[PDB]
Symmetry: C3
Subunit: 205 residues, 3 copies
């Protein structure tokens, strides 16, 4: 099966199986492994790989979408000595995650979010974009081919296409999403469409 | 099966199944969904995802190749009210498409062409490259990691590796393919090889 | 099966099947085709595509890892007239390869190494990175989204995130890995974890 438990390792004594809301659609050509929670009405497309096999949960919130070829994975969060590596764990609303994807988030084709990372609600992570060791706020837009590494992206900001942001000084000066900005309504449209696609694909299964 | 119809949605009353020329080879580990036409002698490699589930056809012309990990998808072209979103439709030779890939085109590994987009004949779209909301002319070369977003690329131009072109002023001043240019003969070689690979893989099926 | 022989072509009279060490783990959702040798304790993750169908071997050394969505492929190394195209062949320790990946190498998620290319031992090829027509030395680090095209990267150097290196003058002046560098210990950690993951996944098969 393409939905599978993670293996036993020196840092993982008990295998976990994914917890998937019954209204989510997981394409048969996607792969979901290990300690993963997938919320309601989520669409996981062909060739996506969500792999949680190094400790700690990967969480994908309600009405989010994980498009074709997207990879979610995380650095080790528990060492061989059972010691939690706090640098590799993100905290959201009192709970620890390896990767936290909020509600109404679009992870567009071929993007990747690698833990430790958190992505806030109503954020569009554009095609081929990359997020690693970063917290991306709510209502953000990562344009195609942008990247955030090692930074916190404030709420309501966008990263222009192709820009690789690696310092907090840069992240603090990113431009704001405004109504006239080209991608200001992109995520709400993509979420609306993908929630309906998930329901349609479920009716073919 | 990995060749599938698209689902019924509020903007898609009738499911469509792919129309695939009998001389094309579709790898069993590729995914082809929905309103897609694939021409003669096309090779579709493992892990490619061609997904046409938001209205309007994705067309891949004769003797083109869609290499490993390539994604083709398109923005919605028909809204919930049956109204065609003309901004998301490209026109080629009197016909409307969500994504049009011409003849003798190579979409190299991990590239992505996202509709609305058209790619003219004898063009090489290099490894990891990205095309979105753009028309790429005939006899063009997108070097690896280049991108064209929101522009028209004139015939016979190349985009240097890593360059992200987002304005028409930039696109108009791209360099020309000449005989001495390093990638001037790359596409013709890749097409020749892939047409022969398609025939060889067909003989193993 | 997802482990397959390459097809007969005008430049490939005899099909080859992959040679895979019994201690390697190949995920069922990976694809391995043709003249490929995979060493001991290698982990090949979901959605990777290793395809050797244009002549000459792709070699992946012991204790290396090929992560999700990684593509390995190579340009033609033998023409239709049986003539070896020496420009497309790399030489390592007296033997010819299309792609040579050394021991203890991490090819991180969504990266791609396209032949002709060689990657030396104990090198980390970061997420979404790209190597083509290049020799990368031992103990190197390609940060996420970096690329090396047409160059030789000296031993013990790193390429900063997002940088596309296309000239030898640039490659010669890359910074050195030192103990205080952020990724100086990344590869050794990733190799340690992936060798243990390979053993755990083997125990579930
Ligand atoms: Zn990882
Ligand atoms: Zn799309
Ligand atoms: Zn190739």
């Amino acid at each position: 099966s393409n939905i599978r438990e993670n293996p036993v390792t020196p840092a993982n004594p008990e295998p976990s199986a994914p917890v998937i809301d019954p209204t989510a659609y997981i394409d048969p050509q996607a792969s979901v492994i290990g300690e993963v929670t997938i919320g309601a009405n989520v669409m996981v497309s062909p060739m996506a790989s969500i792999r949680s096999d190094e400790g700690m949960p990967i969480f994908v919130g309600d009405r989010s979408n994980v498009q074709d070829g997207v990879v979610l994975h995380a650095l080790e969060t528990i060492n061989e000595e059972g010691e939690p590596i706090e640098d590799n764990i993100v905290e959201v609303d009192g709970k620890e995650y390896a990767v936290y994807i909020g509600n109404n988030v679009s992870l567009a084709h071929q993007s990747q979010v690698h833990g430790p990372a958190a992505v806030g609600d109503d954020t569009f992570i554009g095609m081929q974009a990359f997020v690693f060791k970063s917290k991306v706020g709510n209502n953000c837009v990562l344009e195609p081919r942008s990247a955030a590494i090692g930074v916190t992206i404030p709420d309501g900001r966008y990263i222009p296409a192709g820009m690789v942001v690696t310092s907090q000084a840069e992240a603090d000066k990113l431009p704001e999403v405004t109504d006239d900005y080209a991608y200001s309504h992109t995520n709400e449209a993509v979420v609306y469409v993908n929630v309906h696609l998930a329901e349609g694909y479920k009716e073919t299964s």
